[PDB]
């Protein structure tokens, strides 16, 4: 009863404190920065070999190997430069909605409607890929996976909860809660000490990996959040939603800096990623396109017109030499 | 590919493609059907040839030179809107309804409206199953079909009641190009697969008519 009033007034204090800091908009400070021009990027590779639709993709740390997960129950590891197929791993469950490549390149992870985050070992003595561990404990589908080291993985489920695992033992070291809806994505901070997660309840929150506590929560979206990624310097992140808009939040400021909505855009975002410098914000919509946004001025700097169906994943190499996109038409295209 | 090793790497790539292509062929004659409905609605015993195999449960019975896969998504306990797009390519949606559960009837109706009107399933035919005729026939005598449907006006006879319940389910179509193959089944009904098989034939013929340009 009274606590409800205490909850309401607490929100007001945060809103009041949030408003006091706001002095000038991002577009108002950077209005005299010269534009970036028209970014023309032409397809360089066309990785084909998938039969069904493609639902996830991740770049290796060395910017050459790829991993893509499709609905046909195959997990392929591509050689970007030569378009060769290094590996092709059969999956127990054909329903997959994520895939992750370990930083060291020794492991690769997968998951989906089976509520199990499988980990495969690639540098095996026997020369074939084997399932080292099967992580269970989530009561709903699995949305995103990310490696912290060779013995630690952070996962996001539709149970409204994320977790931090210990691959060796197989248990769930720390569990994060606080969301009121399905968690649809997450991204790890560059220093791997914080990470953010956007849920279907139209809000993203920042989490302390070591401590297991929610340090912040961000609002502003009118609908569910489909993708999220950190700014390269680790002090801001951008979110994509079904509202047909992307937004840029700043952790230190604890607010929303800019919006990337356009009158001509009607469908929802499916993926988001930044470039190495952090000046281009690439998002893939359901109109069969990916739009490049000038992250500092909210100007469409170009379009990556390709694919015959929805774009389901995006990726930017750690060296920043290329961009890869996957779509339901069962083709990955590397754009340079 | 000039180098000696890089040549051997290229073989491995071609050998992998061969297995990916061949597995597609071996997995081309399988028809994917989605199972839906309320609980205790017979969604687990539609066909007695189960051969099953928390999460997603699959059943892969085969019949008449065709491989049928039924996917049961019960137990997700999540918001359908986010995993429904996974089954966008299923041939048909197999819906189950229990005529003996008046209280659950409205829940079933609500589900049908959303499934039939979902933007992804704007083109997938629905194979409607109405289960437990005998229990329906026995229960109607003791409790008239008015408590669940106060708007009902026809007689209290079996044929009219079963006909009316079907119409309500069909009344949620509200769209063309999508057809519903309603059927009535009992507990002791062996020929359930035959009904799926024939109805699947008509759905496929409808698609090829779209692809070939005749429509």
């Amino acid at each position, epitope marked *: 009863d009274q606590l409800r009033q205490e909850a309401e007034q607490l929100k007001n204090q945060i809103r009041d404190a949030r408003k006091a800091c706001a002095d000038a908009t991002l577009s108002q400070i950077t209005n005299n920065i010269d534009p970036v021009g028209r970014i023309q990027m032409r397809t360089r590779r066309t990785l084909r070999g998938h039969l069904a639709k493609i639902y996830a993709m991740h770049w290796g740390t060395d910017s050459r190997l790829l991993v893509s997960a499709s609905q046909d129950g195959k997990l392929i590891i591509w050689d970007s430069y030569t378009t060769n197929k290094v590996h092709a791993i059969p999956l127990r469950s054909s329903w997959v909605m994520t895939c992750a490549y370990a930083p060291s*390149g020794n492991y690769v992870a997968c998951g989906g409607l089976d509520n199990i985050c499988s980990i495969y070992n690639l540098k095996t003595r026997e020369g074939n890929v084997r399932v080292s561990r099967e992580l269970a404990g989530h009561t709903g589908y699995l949305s995103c996976c990310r490696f912290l080291d060779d013995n630690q993985i952070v996962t996001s489920s539709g149970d409204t909860t994320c977790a931090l695992w210990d691959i060796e033992t197989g248990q769930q070291t720390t569990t994060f809660t606080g969301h009121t809806g399905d968690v649809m994505s997450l991204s790890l901070a560059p220093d791997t000490r914080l990470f953010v997660s956007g849920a279907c309840d139209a809000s993203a929150k920042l989490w302390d990996v070591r401590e297991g506590m929610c340090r912040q929560t961000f609002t502003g979206h009118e609908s569910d959040i489909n993708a999220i990624c950190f700014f390269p310097n680790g002090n801001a992140f951008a979110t994509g939603s079904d509202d047909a808009t992307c937004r840029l939040f700043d952790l230190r400021a604890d607010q929303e800096l800019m919006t990337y909505s356009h009158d001509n855009i009607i469908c929802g975002i499916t993926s988001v990623s930044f470039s190495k410098s952090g000046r281009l914000l690439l998002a893939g919509y359901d109109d069969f396109n990916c739009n490049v946004w000038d992250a500092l001025k909210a100007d469409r700097a170009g379009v990556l017109a390709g694919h015959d169906n929805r774009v389901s994943c995006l990726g930017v190499t750690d060296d920043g030499m290329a961009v890869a996109t996957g779509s339901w038409d069962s083709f990955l295209k590397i754009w340079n | 590919t*000039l180098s000696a090793e*890089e040549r051997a*790497a290229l073989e491995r790539s071609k*050998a992998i493609e061969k297995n990916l292509k061949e597995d597609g062929i071996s997995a081309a004659k399988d028809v994917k059907l989605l199972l839906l409905g309320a609980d205790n609605s017979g969604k687990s015993t539609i066909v007695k040839q189960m051969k099953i195999i928390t999460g997603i449960v699959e059943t892969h019975f085969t019949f008449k030179n065709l491989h049928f896969r039924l996917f049961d998504v019960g137990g997700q306990r999540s918001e359908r809107k986010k995993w429904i797009h996974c089954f966008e390519d299923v041939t048909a949606i197999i819906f189950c309804v229990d005529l003996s559960d008046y209280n659950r009837m409205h829940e079933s109706l609500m589900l049908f409206d959303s499934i039939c009107n979902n933007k992804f399933f704007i083109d997938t035919s629905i194979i409607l199953f109405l289960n437990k005729k005998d229990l329906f026939g026995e229960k109607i005598k003791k409790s008239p079909l008015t408590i669940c449907f106060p708007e009902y006006t026809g007689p209290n006879t079996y044929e009219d009641a079963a006909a009316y319940i079907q119409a309500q389910f069909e009344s949620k179509n509200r769209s063309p190009n999508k057809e519903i193959y309603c059927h009535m089944t009992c507990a002791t009904d062996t020929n359930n697969a035959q009904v799926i098989f024939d109805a699947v034939t008509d759905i496929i013929i409808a698609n090829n008519l779209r692809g070939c340009g005749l429509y």
Partner: single-chain antibody, 233 residues
Framework: DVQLVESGGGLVQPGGSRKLSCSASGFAFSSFGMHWVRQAPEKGLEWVAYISSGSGTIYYADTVKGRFTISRDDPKNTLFLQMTSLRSEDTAMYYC??????????????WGQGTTLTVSSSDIVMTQATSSVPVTPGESVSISCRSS???????????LYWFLQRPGQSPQLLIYRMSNLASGVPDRFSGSGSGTAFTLTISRLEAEDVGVYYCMQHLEYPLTFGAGTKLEL
């Protein structure tokens, strides 16, 4: 554990024929290219034949073309070498070696234990200048070997391999392209080079490192080994 065992050698009369069998157990034999490598009595390794995965490719060294034929039996997990007419030059110990080729692979990691064969009585040339190098434990050592062409390729990968043969055992891989340490070896080993001159350097020499070192090129067939350098304690 991975294991390759060979059999079928012995004493044969000149012009006779024999069949050597190499039976694998402990890995996905169907996915590995298998080599045959022979070592005449205290002379040095010499490549013989190679059959790829799926038997799609086959090669032979000029010394044995036509007389030797190589075959693989995938379902049985076995490798066969059929020798038709044997001269007195073919007496040697034959090794069964495995190789898997893909981006970032280690294509000679394991060697068989080998079988003894006795017979009763254009190419890149790699040279190892020094034949012996006495040394005591704890002293830095260096081993170098030259080449005819520049092994450096357009890809940027220098195709050179360093093998270590201990007394009485089969060789063991150390460095597979120019500087990558093969899995299982101590980090003390290192390798470097440029184009046509290469060197292997050892720090904190141990008592188990005494043996013979062979430098091999994999740029293009036929594969060629160096004469070999011996370390004496």
């Amino acid at each position: 554990d991975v294991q390759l065992v060979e059999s079928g050698g012995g004493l044969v009369q000149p012009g006779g024929s024999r069949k050597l069998s190499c039976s694998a157990s402990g890995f996905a034999f169907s996915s590995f290219g298998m080599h045959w490598v022979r070592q005449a009595p205290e002379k040095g390794l010499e490549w013989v034949a190679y059959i790829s995965s799926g038997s799609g490719t086959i090669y032979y060294a000029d010394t044995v073309k036509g007389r030797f034929t190589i075959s693989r039996d995938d379902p049985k997990n076995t490798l066969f070498l059929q020798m038709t007419s044997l001269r007195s030059e073919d007496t040697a110990m034959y090794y069964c070696v495995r190789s898997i080729y893909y981006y970032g692979s280690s294509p000679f990691d394991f060697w068989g234990q080998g079988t003894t064969l006795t017979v009763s009585s254009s190419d890149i040339v790699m040279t190892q200048a020094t034949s012996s190098v006495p040394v005591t434990p704890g002293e830095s050592v260096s081993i170098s070997c030259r080449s005819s062409k520049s092994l450096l390729h357009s890809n940027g990968n220098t195709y050179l391999y360093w093998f270590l043969q201990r007394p009485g055992q089969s060789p063991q891989l150390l460095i597979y392209r120019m500087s990558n340490l093969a899995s299982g070896v101590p980090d003390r080993f290192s390798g470097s080079g440029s184009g046509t001159a290469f060197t292997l350097t050892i720090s904190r020499l141990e008592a188990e490192d005494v043996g013979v070192y062979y430098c091999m090129q994999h740029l293009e067939y036929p594969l060629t080994f160096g004469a070999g350098t011996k370390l004496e304690l």
